[PDB]
């Protein structure tokens, strides 16, 4: 690790600076170094890790979609042949994206998940595992595609089972997990009815529990509930 010589606390401090400067690649590298110190992460530190990689891979996904669309148009009838360059460059971006996903999955497997015993940590890491397998599935076209999809499903499912047993229905991590697993069903698994059912039941069961919350918790939960509603509106 190039971060092996930097103090854990300094890595965390610099991750926060990198976030302020919108330097998400640096942020991710600092958080990878922090994870590799071997200690468990606090709630705030788990948020830093997830924000850094979500922004890095989100930019890669957006670029991959632009290039994939150009590549599809180049393969339509009446399109002038332009050579291998579009495919090559799409492949370059795809391979980088896969590398980032493999890095995150590697941190989760070595050894964040196995030491995560509380629901708030374990559900969040298993949600991340589902997310990064989902990003791998978005670009998969080969003989492991079904296994990649199933890996995402299995991680999400374990997170769901824990979240339903151990968290209230308004817990933001439970809500965000459900939001993303619902998207998995709709976009990856060819299961729009499951996606819709999950989003609706999650939203309704959260609504019924809002009365138990403080004003600040209510704000946190309703924010994610609105995302579930936005997806339901998109899908119906």
């Amino acid at each position: 690790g190039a971060m092996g010589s930097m103090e854990r606390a300094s890595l965390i401090q610099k991750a926060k600076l990198a976030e302020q400067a919108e330097r998400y690649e640096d942020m991710a590298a600092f958080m990878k170094g922090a994870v590799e110190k071997g200690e468990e992460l606090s709630n705030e530190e788990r948020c830093l890790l997830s924000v850094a990689y979500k922004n890095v891979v989100g930019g890669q996904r957006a670029a991959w979609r632009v290039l994939s669309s150009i590549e599809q148009k180049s393969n339509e009838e009446g399109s002038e042949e332009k050579g291998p360059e579009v495919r090559e460059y799409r492949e370059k971006v795809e391979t980088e994206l896969q590398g980032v996903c493999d890095t995150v999955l590697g941190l989760l497997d070595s050894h964040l998940i196995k030491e995560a015993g509380d629901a708030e940590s374990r559900v969040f890491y298993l949600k991340m595992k589902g997310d990064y397998y989902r990003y791998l599935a978005e670009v998969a076209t080969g003989d492991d595609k079904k296994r990649i999809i199933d890996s995402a499903r299995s991680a999400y499912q374990e997170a769901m089972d824990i979240s339903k047993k151990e968290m209230p229905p308004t817990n933001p991590i439970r809500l965000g997990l459900a939001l993303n697993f619902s998207v998995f069903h709709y976009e990856i698994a060819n299961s729009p009815e499951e996606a819709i059912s999950l989003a609706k039941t999650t939203f309704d069961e959260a609504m019924a529990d809002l009365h138990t919350l403080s004003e600040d918790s209510y704000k946190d939960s309703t924010l994610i509930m609105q995302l579930l509603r936005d997806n339901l509106t998109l899908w119906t």
Partner: peptide
């Protein structure tokens, strides 16, 4: 695209 967090 749909919303994810």
């Amino acid at each position: 695209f749909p919303a994810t967090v």
